[PDB]
Amino acid sequence: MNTVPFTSAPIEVTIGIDQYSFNVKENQPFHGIKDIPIGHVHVIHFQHADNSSMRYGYWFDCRMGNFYIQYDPKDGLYKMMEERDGAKFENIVHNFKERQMMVSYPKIDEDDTWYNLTEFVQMDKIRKIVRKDENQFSYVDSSMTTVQENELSDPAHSLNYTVINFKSREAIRPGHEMEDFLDKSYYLNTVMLQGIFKNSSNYFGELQFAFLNAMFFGNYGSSLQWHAMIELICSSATVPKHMLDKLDEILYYQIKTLPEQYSDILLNERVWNICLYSSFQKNSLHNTEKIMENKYPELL
Amino acid sequence: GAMNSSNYAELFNNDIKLFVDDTNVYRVTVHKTFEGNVATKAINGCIFTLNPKTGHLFLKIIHTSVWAGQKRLSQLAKWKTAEEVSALVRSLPKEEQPKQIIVTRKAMLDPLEVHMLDFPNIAIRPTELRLPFSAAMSIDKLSDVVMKATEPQMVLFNIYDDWLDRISSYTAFSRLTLLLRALKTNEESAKMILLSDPTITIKSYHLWPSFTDEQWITIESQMRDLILTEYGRKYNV
Ligand SMILES: Cc1ccccc1CNC(=O)C1(C(=O)O)CC1
Ligand SMILES: Cc1ccccc1CNC(=O)C1(C(=O)O)CC1
């Protein structure tokens, strides 16, 4: 088990760690989070008590370095930093562990939620969507725009999700207009799966990362990407049977985890009613349809 | 965006534009079968593609063979319409291609937009006008050439005959829409109005009779009376 230590907590902040969250008071003796499960990406995120503007945070993998958080009073935000001196790092963490100034990632042993939300998400692929190559971790916030959003404004601070546009020459073979627009299988399987993503795991990883950025940061462009990637599969008549079974699992746990009170802003009625009730795959998502119908029956 | 009564004069400015009406593309008769079920039988249709400034009508005749062995024909018809309009645009020299295409029915927007992806500078727009272009099949010479066709065919017409020699295209479009609205509301009476007088004839190369300026005023007044008459018959007014 690894540890994200904190130099201090000079400003009152709500800290989230994956699907969990907690509150730290201004100048409380807080020095970070221990017992973080090795083997998964993680995200540590922040909402300042005195300005709920900008949720921001960091995607990281403790297998790729030793990371700590220090407040920077000039830029006014908790910053993730890498410490290259491993011995200095182990010594500072041990002192914070001995003084019990670190909270514990509260993972219930029966609970596989985080695995189920991040099954296909890999740090190497996060770093190609979020470009900042001098760091091993990736910063995301509520206001960052996506490459597609920008096509319709600083490219350095963009989310480079794969562009999906149903009324584009990429999506539509000349001479197969009606066929490709009403059945997206060409676009899904040849352009995206074979062409761009290479495999379904990489596709699912971007989908899962888009959902998590939408949920943890209220990132609107991420929410658009998540829904676009669902719609592309559901609107395809030909999908590998294993892909549909796995999609049902992926969406089930995303709908299960979603705050009930954020449903109005994280879920697109048009997309979901189409996917569950009109699309080619309207019958291939039994678990997701059941949780949606019992939990968000209004949206439908 | 959508074309309506505020930006109505845009139809007659110098930006090339076409109206596309698909309401006569897929045409059927409905009848009982020997077994007492119901069957449809398709008949020839047409795409109505009109330059409102010039009167040029590109009438693409849709022969019943295009439906042979196809499913979901009402949906296919929107895509076949879009396919034919796109091929028409591609067959025009660059300086004759439209800058906008206005579809009379919103269900045409996505089919045409998708067929015209290669032309990102051509705007595809709906309209809030209720245009009577479905009545084009009530014009004898157009109905004739559609029903006689034995194969796909494009026939070219000026739907304003020679009116632009004497009136603006605003006025000619208004005369056209009033004629077509009347033919749609009461076809028999509209045709009675147009052809009661034997002394007034239709030139071989025209669609409508050769009315003088004063006779057109009389005719237009009679068409407005027909529409009002039918409105009162309908609603018991
Ligand atoms: C104090 C603390 C420290 C680290 C992480 C979380 C917490 C408290 N939050 C929770 O325990 C739960 C949540 O939904 O957030 C599981 C219920
Ligand atoms: C938390 C942590 C972990 C690894 C490296 C640096 C830090 C922050 N550095 C410190 O807090 C101290 C320092 O002299 O550096 C005071 C001990």
Helix axes A286-295, A241-257, angle to 10 degrees: 20
Determination approach:
X-ray
**Distance (Å, whole) CA A250 – CA A244:** 10
Atom 17 in ligand 2: residue holding the nearest Cα = A92
Residue in chain B lying closest to A171 (CA): B114
Whether A90 and A183 map to the same domain: the answer is no
Beta strands A77-82; A103-104: pairing state: unpaired
Query: Ligand 2 in contact with A137 (CB < 6 A)?
Result: no
**Distance (Å, whole) CA A255 – CA A267:** 9
DSSP conformational letter for B120: T
- Nearest-CA distance from B107 to chain A in Å? 13
Query: Ligand 2 in contact with A80 (CB < 6 A)?
Result: no
Tokens of A32: 């970070």
**Distance (Å, whole) CA A3 – CA A6:** 10
Please enumerate in sequence order all residues whose Cβ is within 8 A of that of B56, keeping only pairs 6 or more positions apart, or say none.
Answer: B50, B156, B157, B158
Inter-residue contact A268 to A299 (CB < 8 Å): no
b/e sequence A72-95, b meaning 16+ C-beta within 10 Å: eeeeebbebeebeeeeebeebbee
Please enumerate in sequence order all residues whose Cβ is within 8 A of that of A261, keeping only pairs 6 or more positions apart, or say none.
Answer: none
Per this entry, what is the length of chain A? 300
* Chain center to CA of A138: 12
Interface of B with A in 33-92 (CB under 8 A): 76, 79, 82-83
Q: Which residues pair with A103 in a beta bridge?
A: A33
Residue contact B110–A167, C-beta within 8 A: yes
DSSP string covering chain A? -EEEEBS---S-EEEEETTEEEEE-TT----EEEEEPTTS-EEEEEEETTEEEEEEEEEE-GGG--EEEEEETTTTEEEEEE---HHHHHHHHHHHHHTT-SEE----TT--HHHHHHTT--HHHHHHHS--TT-SSEEEETTPEEHHHHH---GGGEE-PPP--TTSTTTS-TT-HHHHHH-THIIIIIIIIIIIISSHHHHHHHHHHHHHHHHHH--HHHHHHHHHHHHHHHT-S---HHHHHHHHHHHHHHHHHS-GGGHHHH--HHHHHIIIIISTTTTS-HHHHHHHHHH-GGG-
Residue contact A172–B117, C-beta within 8 A: yes
The answer, for A71 touching chain B at a CB cutoff of 8 Å, is no
**Distance (Å, whole) CA A31 – CA A15:** 12
Whether A261 and A298 map to the same domain: the answer is yes
CB-closest option in B76, B79, B114 to A167: B114
Inter-residue contact A84 to A24 (CB < 8 Å): no
**Distance (Å, whole) CA A222 – CA A228:** 10
Asked if the B9-163 domain carries CATH number 3.30.390.30, the reply is no
Partners of residue B118 in chain A, C-beta under 8 Å: 169, 174
Q: Which atom of ligand 1 is nearest to the CA of A21?
A: 15
Tokens of A259: 């705050």
By most ligand atoms within 8 Å of CB, the mutation choice from A4, A6, A21 for ligand 1 is A21
**Distance (Å, whole) CA A138 – CA A45:** 11
Whether A103 and A159 map to the same domain: the answer is no
Tokens of B120: 């990102």
**Distance (Å, whole) CA B237 – CA A251:** 59
Range of the domain at A112: 1-143
Choosing from A143, A178, A194, the residue where a domain stops is A143
**Distance (Å, whole) CA B180 – CA B163:** 16
CATH superfamily of B164-237: Prp8 RNase H domain, fingers region (1.20.80.40)
Element (H, E) at B83: helix B73-91
Whether A189 and A79 map to the same domain: the answer is no
Residue contact B76–A167, C-beta within 8 A: no
Atom 7 in ligand 1: residue holding the nearest Cα = A22
Choosing from A143, A173, A195, the residue where a domain stops is A143
Atom 11 in ligand 2: residue holding the nearest Cα = A7
Inter-residue contact B47 to B25 (CB < 8 Å): yes
Inter-residue contact A221 to A227 (CB < 8 Å): no
Residue contact B117–A181, C-beta within 8 A: no
Residue contact A177–B110, C-beta within 8 A: no
Choosing from A105, A121, A143, the residue where a domain stops is A143
Reference B115, options B80, B83, B76; nearest CA is B83
Whether A86 and A226 map to the same domain: the answer is no
> Which ligand sits closest to the CA of A71?
2
Q: To what resolution in angstroms was this structure determined?
A: 1.6
Partners of residue B76 in chain A, C-beta under 8 Å: 178
**Distance (Å, whole) CA B180 – CA B193:** 13
Reference A252, options A280, A221, A211, A220; nearest CA is A211
By most ligand atoms within 8 Å of CB, the mutation choice from A4, A6, A20 for ligand 1 is A20
Domain boundaries, chain B: 9-163, 164-237
